Amino acid sequence: GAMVLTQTHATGHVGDFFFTHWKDGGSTSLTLDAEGKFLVTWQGGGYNYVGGPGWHFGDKNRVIRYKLNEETGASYIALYGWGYDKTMSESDPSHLVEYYILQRWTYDPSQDGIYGKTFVSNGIEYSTYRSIRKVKPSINGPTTFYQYWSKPSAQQELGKDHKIIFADHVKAWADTGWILPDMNNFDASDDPTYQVLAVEVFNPQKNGTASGQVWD
């Protein structure tokens, strides 16, 4: 009922759960079982990691539940995913969209974004931001695309069951005219339009652990 991912790059399923797992070096590993329990342990010494458990596809009505038992300081923990419309012009930055719903962070990755609006979801106050990536990596290769962010007004604590109500963030982005392209396809060259609870660790100074469970 589990995989221990230690390779530099891997995607796939463990039972009902999808995962993506990316490393530019080092011994960082992701363990995931079929009940959505996950464990990321990272090296400490300056490589980068992005990975976590989730669904290959973005469901506009998904209610994501998770709890973190351990989180020693990963650059950020965020719901993380993609939308992609193969019929749209590739010079239109909305043809492909990377989106983040941040739960915790050492530094704020949304700081380059332009503010959209503030709203409440599951009793949590969020603010939204939109930035652009110019000729950067993506599920469809190097391209120029928008990033949509939702950032909570406080860090989400460990040891508690949290909820991310994806419909609320889709709506908040749409409220400012930020539309998500199709989130249920494989049309892109490199990856499906997945949606995962990502553990992101950039240039870590100390060894680290993030563990918990995700479900919907």
Author numbering: 1 to 216
Paper text:
A number of predicted genes that showed similarity to carbohydrate active enzymes (CAZymes) were selected for expression leading to the discovery of the first exo-1,4-β-xylanase from glycoside hydrolase family 11 (GH11). This enzyme was able to degrade xylooligomers, which are known inhibitors to commercially available cellulase cocktails, as well as xylan, yielding xylobiose as the only reaction product. Compost21_GH11 was found to be an exo-1,4-β-xylanase with highest activity against xylan at pH 6.0 at 35 °C. The enzyme retained more than 60% activity for all tested pHs, but the observed activity quickly dropped at temperatures higher than 40 °C. However, at 35 °C and pH 6.0, compost21_GH11 retained 90% activity for up to 96 h.
The final model was constructed from the first to last residue of the crystallized protein, which was cloned without the first 13 residues that were predicted as a disordered region and reported as a signal peptide. The structure of compost21_GH11 shows a typical GH11 fold of a β-jelly-roll. The curvature of the β-sheets B1 to B9 forms a cleft where the catalytic residues (nucleophile Glu98 in β-sheet B6 and proton donor Glu200 in β-sheet B4) are located. Two extra loops (EL1 and EL2) are found in the compost21_GH11 structure. They are created by additional residues, which stretch between β-sheets B5 and B6 and in β-sheet B4, respectively. EL2 blocks substrate interaction at subsite − 3, which accommodates the non-reducing end of xylan. This loop is stabilized by a number of hydrogen bonds within the loop main/side chain residues and van der Walls interactions, especially between Pro192 and Phe186 side chains. Hydrogen bonds are also established with EL1 and with the turn that connects β-sheets B7 and B8.
